[PDB]
Amino acid sequence: ALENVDAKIAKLMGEGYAFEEVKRALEIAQNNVEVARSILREFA
Numbered sequence: 001a002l003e004n005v006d007a008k009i010a011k012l013m014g015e016g017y018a019f020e021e022v023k024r025a026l027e028i029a030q031n032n033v034e035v036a037r038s039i040l041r042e043f044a
Contacts, residue, residue: 008033012040
């Protein structure tokens with residue numbers, strides 16, 4: 001509709017964690033939220 005990457009970020013914001021860890025986990029994982037989520041709960 002308007003936002004693109006924000007949808008992914010917010011998708012990770014749900015769980016509630018650092019911002020730097022989210023965005024970085026998004027780009028590095030090749031715009032993948034699932035993979036990011038896997039490492040999002042893995043702390044590091």
